[PDB]
Write a protein that holds these residues in place. Sequence first.
Motif: not given
Lengths: 122, 55, 232, 232, 232, 98, 50, 49, 49, 33, 33, 33
Positions: C74-77, C154-164
Amino acid sequence: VFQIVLGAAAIAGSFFTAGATLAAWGAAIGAGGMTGILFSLGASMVLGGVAQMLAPKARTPRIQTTDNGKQNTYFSSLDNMVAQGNVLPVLYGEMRVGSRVVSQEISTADEGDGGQVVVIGR
Amino acid sequence: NGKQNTYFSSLDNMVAQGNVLPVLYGEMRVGSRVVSQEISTADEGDGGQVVVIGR
Amino acid sequence: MQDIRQETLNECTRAEQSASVVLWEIDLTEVGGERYFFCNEQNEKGEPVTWQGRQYQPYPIQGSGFELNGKGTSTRPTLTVSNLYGMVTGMAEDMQSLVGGTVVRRKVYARFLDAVNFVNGNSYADPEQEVISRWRIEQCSELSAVSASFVLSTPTETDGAVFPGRIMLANTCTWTYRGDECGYSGPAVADEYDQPTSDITKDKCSKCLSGCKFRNNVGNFGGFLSINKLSQ
Amino acid sequence: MQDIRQETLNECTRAEQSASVVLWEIDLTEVGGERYFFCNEQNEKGEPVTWQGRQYQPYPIQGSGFELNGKGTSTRPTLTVSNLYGMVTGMAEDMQSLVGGTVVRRKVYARFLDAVNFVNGNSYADPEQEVISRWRIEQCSELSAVSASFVLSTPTETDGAVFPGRIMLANTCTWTYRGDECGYSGPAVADEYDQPTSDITKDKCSKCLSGCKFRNNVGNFGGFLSINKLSQ
Amino acid sequence: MQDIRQETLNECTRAEQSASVVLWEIDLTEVGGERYFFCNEQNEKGEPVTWQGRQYQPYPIQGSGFELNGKGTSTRPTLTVSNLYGMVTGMAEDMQSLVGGTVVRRKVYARFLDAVNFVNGNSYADPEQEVISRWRIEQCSELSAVSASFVLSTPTETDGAVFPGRIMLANTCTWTYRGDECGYSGPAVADEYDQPTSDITKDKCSKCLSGCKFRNNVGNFGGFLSINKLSQ
Amino acid sequence: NYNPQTRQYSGIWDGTFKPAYSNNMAWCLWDMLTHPRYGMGKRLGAADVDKWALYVIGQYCDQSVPDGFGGTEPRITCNAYLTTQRKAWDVLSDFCSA
Amino acid sequence: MGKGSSKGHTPREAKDNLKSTQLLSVIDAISEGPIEGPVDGLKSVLLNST
Amino acid sequence: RHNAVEVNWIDPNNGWETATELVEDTQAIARYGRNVTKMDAFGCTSRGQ
Amino acid sequence: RHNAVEVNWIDPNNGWETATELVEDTQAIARYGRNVTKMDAFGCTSRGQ
Amino acid sequence: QIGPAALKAVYDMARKGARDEIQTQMRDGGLFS
Amino acid sequence: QIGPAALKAVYDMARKGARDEIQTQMRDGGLFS
Amino acid sequence: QIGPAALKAVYDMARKGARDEIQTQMRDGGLFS
Ligand code: SF4
Ligand code: SF4
Ligand code: SF4
């Protein structure tokens, strides 16, 4: 004359490499007495977290689908594992432990343990 | 042995401690995360009034 | 294609065009701060640039690394701003290094700016001609006596998240106290150490079974009070 | 803080200070060699620099990469030396390329050097003012007709080590012959090929069961003489 | 050592030697194309360079990254050629970007070139003095209005291959239709959708069991028609 | 001068170790680092590891802190059972992160 | 009941009518070097889980 | 800036198995989202540790 | 500069299982510490190989 | 610019760039270096 | 060449070289980066 | 200096630095590249 010591605004776009103008250093390409391009380790050391710079963040074993959902650690075992080319475990205090089976034999128990009198049938 | 597993199914009754709660998205035949499993003695008589033990 | 007005597309194809002004807004309202508006330049009258009736105060600010790529990371300005006079410093010690805030970037052709910016006025002034992009502050990468650099994401940035995400535990509730799943609305009962309190500002749940019993909420307990023995 | 004397601390804060001399010592006694003392400079009388009564001979030598960092990879300094006249070459062919030796580095202010170094003497001469650091030679990275570069490492360097290290084997002893755990002190019996010998210089253990029986040391055998059949 | 003639070895050790010309050949015959011959230079008579009786046409071509290393990654050379006048473009749209072709590189000392090249002739002309290397085109890395760069690889290049390769499947044949293992030589029966056809140009096995039954070739079916129930 | 059963120190140490069973993790790390048979004693060796730093670390780990059930408890403790062979850096990092 | 060695030996129940007795002789390897020993004694030996 | 941690210790009371203890800081969860991690406590056999 | 090696071959005599053979060089262990590795012998079914 | 001094600077800048790229690839998409 | 502008170019070329080397090491022999 | 050859030399130096950094990160702490 100076030490540049590049930071983070300089590497992320040449907006502040010219902020110091790097004039006399570049004209002197540096020196043998002193070195440039220091590259401060501020943001690089903190990428994993502040707690990573104080502790080494102990690891955990890989999750194996052989176990249904059971979690294993790296510092205990309740199994009688195979003892060939496997290193002998180290135990550090308390713990309920398995073992590395060295010998396992099945035979016929011989009646009579000690002393003199032995009775077979009663 | 040679069985292939996927990342989107399970037909096992897995251990349910520190193991998150799965999510099912339509249809599928599923295993489970066993929450309780106890073996006891069944008590004769289900409902109503009349109960007969021996016949 | 982006949904941009026909005037901007008409200006983009011109051989000789007006200067492209980039206006920045820092929104720390969701993190407990205020909203700041910046522009890299003043106007021809030595005043902050007025866009849509709002003044954007002059301040040295420059963004880089803005791109739209789906493949890969993901782009990181990055956003570099002046830290002379210790201004950004004052924000770093008040807003927890501005982390979690929002950065709004508008691209506007100078021909569409408000008429107050120019001495002779603007006949083509149009407040609806702008290109807007939103990002979040991820880390104040550097802060010194000269400048300050921020990493944007970006506001989404699914970096540290997990599922479920919900985890099956015993002797511990995973719900949020007085939340929707917890569903508790009673008076102050106890604190996080189970000590009884009538103070609403000191009312917290220990997340243990006793804490739930203190509120008679055992039905809504987020734990599973049998799994501790089947895992042996 | 490092335990260094008050005189060095007083000198470190002065505006105009003396030259900081760095004296090197290469200790190959543990690997079957000698100790060589070097300094990058002579003194004002054109003689090897005398420190604490010991002469450090002039030789082009320069170390770099010295740092104290705990996080991440263990620090590996480097030491470049002059290979003119084929001196280091002669050391490489006699000490297995110096691998395993020790390098001792002393930082000393030139004001504290011995009075013999200066024509007018040294009133502030103090042999107890030095900063000492020990490292180990890991690899002679480059050896040419001009120079020679050595990689240094901390003496600990837990790189190739494993824990626990003792392995469970059958038909092979993991002990060291005539060592602690082997506990053998008898006369010469046989060589590593089990052939009987009365020669003490040819007395080695085959590490098999027969070699142990030759010495009547089966009680202290380092193997486990049943595990071959249980592992099937 | 390479098996090269004594004349080339004699020339290699001379203090003053002739220019080493490199002649390139692009062979697309196995991929449905022709063979092209190139040399970076003309001769002294302004003609394409004649070697062994074959004319190599003048064209800007230059190779780099040629080496023989066994340890590590397989060497991937590169070949840059002129794309002025869109010639290579023409090959890229006709040969699937030349991918899969062969590139043959010959190193020849100019002293051994054919006598027709030089005005005064060549007394030492020898058509058997050359060093030959073969590579394959892996990817046309860049193609522009100026130049074109091709990645080369060794013909072996065990990159995407696996071993063993034959896969055990049910309901699908892994053999090649009318191949050696399939062993079918009958007339046209049906197409890949099992629809019967008497057209030989539209005859292809569906690779299912019905497609095999259409040809009465179930004995040579490449699948295992029971494994689908034992894998449960 | 250390009594592992009571986890108390008498006075100044001076060195001079003693073979007593203890749950102190600083000295479990010390054994892991300086044991010649199965540890890293052949390499490395004593006088390369700061024993005073480990002494202060073990003193810190022996301090009593609230148990959470009502009583008190030593701050940091051992009871690991290492069976698999891992690299020495891994075990050292786990010890230094515990 | 000792350091470095122990004997345990809970006695065997007397048999009724002759019959043989299958015996399971195992040897288990644990830890390295001098270890303290059992926490309690023969109550610290679990045969299946008891 | 993690505000939720799952620590894997080993319980000696239920059975010598891996028990997961969840530590949270609900104040920081209202400021920096909810950053959760897993960690293995090396020598832990007491819930408090 | 490795001095101790654990080679994993397959014994056809005890049973077709992985047997570990320890090769050492005690002279080099007195010079370059003790550098130990593991290695799988590919086609090996004889102790000598 | 004298080459001998500039080559070390280029090497150190290359090392920093390699470290930055490696740390970047350990992010979500990336290559995990 | 002015240093401030050249340093950014050197850094970005270093980034490109690091990415290329990483992708090269993901090949068969390589190092798998 | 002329830009073309300088850029090529910088590219090879960057590749060497990236390879050295990768081989360095495969050590104990590092990142395992
Ligand atoms: S323990 Fe009960 S009261 Fe406390 S947060 Fe959970 S559900 Fe709510
Ligand atoms: S086999 Fe016996 S004699 Fe030989 S080294 Fe081992 S214990 Fe010593
Ligand atoms: S299915 Fe039968 S006819 Fe078709 S390719 Fe396979 S073997 Fe040949």
